[model samples]
Target: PYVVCRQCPEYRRQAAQPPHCPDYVCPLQGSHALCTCCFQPMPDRRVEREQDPRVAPQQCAVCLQPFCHLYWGCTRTGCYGCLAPFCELNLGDKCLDGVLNNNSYESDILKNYLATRGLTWKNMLTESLVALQRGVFLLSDYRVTGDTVLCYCCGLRSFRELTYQYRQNIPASELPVAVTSRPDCYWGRNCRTQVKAHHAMKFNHICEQTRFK
Candidate 1:
């Protein structure tokens, strides 16, 4: 025996031709509806992940759409939004900009501190350059809770804050760096997790890289 929606108890028509589309539609029609057909879905394409009109206005980084539900299942147990290869492997550069350090104020304080020592020139560059340097070190050290701060990953000074300054513009010589070794590159930490979760739900297994790291 076989069953179809037309034969189901829920099947009903409000009018001669059924003026309304029921919340539940026939799955049998789905294959036919999705396959070759004369009519098309009014909105032909699904909104892509990066730019959907619905989610963009809210500054929503995760949700693709209310109906589509892009980030829900994938966001758990993985780097859901991150989309870079290096991020996938947990071997990419970590960022550390620390933009709100108030470097200018510290420079002013250092100028006052130096004036107490009576080493004032006509201008004296307004503040000591060494004082500015010290303020950077002090604030940066407070953030990390360490002395002699050096970046654990890039081996640069922690105070340097390259994470915020990871500009895309690289030297021509460094063009090969992305291929040979991603010194400062990584997979999107968020998207990779989500994509991996999606694959796992679909195939009942964890996603793994067969080629590139």
Candidate 2:
């Protein structure tokens, strides 16, 4: 019988056995061959293994199932699904990594930075960062650095080898926020923000705008 353990895919491998149904089957939690569609952790909310044939035997959404541990039906001590230690709204860097129990490197570093001041999530650090990321385009509204730019293509945070050469082409006036002294900036280039080369030598020539936000 298929195990119902998938309601908490994040919990797979965390312990010797899944919290709820030890017999449940989850693609991420089970051997690669498991039929994830009909299994406990389905790929999509609408995916039906018993009926729909489209879902492959393996792949599925990252947060395929929602956590229900806080509800009465759940027997686990904590809510499952995207198993962060706390609610999504209160999550910081831990949410980015999709878990909340242990301190991720970035989150721990961040906590240390704020600990001295006795500040913490109570200040809404995560909320502020998220809001800032989404509102960056608007920065130009108040401070129009006609020469300055912030292209997503060559952002320093998620660097790629192919884009290094492209960086030279940005005029000194078009440098990103962090590279103000550099030769160029791409502040308004949406292409950079969306398209990215995942691995070294993985750069593609095609323009796939729809693939990104």
Candidate 3:
């Protein structure tokens, strides 16, 4: 509190600045309205997961189940790697493995892989075209960037040498069939380890695991 009265003419003449003015205008916090005196945004009073009260409880795309919504109930977490929605039970532990929790290499790989196929996190979540089927999304029906259907799990091409049959809409019973393969955890794990070594030695950038212990 100031000793001088703000309304006093003498105090106003002494200091050119306004009596109760803050040093800087406070920035907005989310969508809260600004204060008239200091121009600072009002504090957020809403509870977590209620930022937008109008929005209903969201559903998990992976398991196709409604998210629990009891007061402060269990919520879904997006995978840091792929940014896909998954319930707590299946989040990173089961939905995604070595691909995400590694170093820069896999990050770049995943980025390019999705980018080339024009599949964004949003597309994967809502669109039935790329939704999970038989443990992975099948892209064979779309023929995106290539003829072979890509398996989301292993980043491998499935039903090889059968693009012609699939493209022609041949009978499923007569076509050669192959399953998608899971990615090798060793590659991502080792790649990250080697890069960290190089950075530690050559670049002197001490690589450290930041999160998800």
Report the alpha-carbon TM-score of model 3 versus the true structure. 0.24
CA lDDT of 124 in candidate 2?
A: 40
lDDT of 1: 0.25
Across residues 1-213, which tens digit of lDDT does each residue of candidate 2 receive?
Answer: 333344435554465554577523355533322222122333332334337655332221222333222111223222222122211222223322301112132223334434645655434433333333454322212322212122211111111111222222335443333334222112222234213323111322212234324
RMSD of candidate 2 to the truth, in angstroms, is 15.7
Residue-level lDDT of model 1, residues 68-116, one tens digit each, is: 1121111223232321111121212222112112222212323343355
Q: Using TM-score as the measure, name the better of candidate 1 and candidate 3.
A: 3
Number of clashes recorded per candidate: 19, 21, 0
* Model 1 ranges off by over 4 Å: 1-52, 55-73, 80-213
TM-score, candidate 2, is: 0.24
What range of 10 consecutive residues in model 2 has the weakest lDDT sum?
A: 153-162
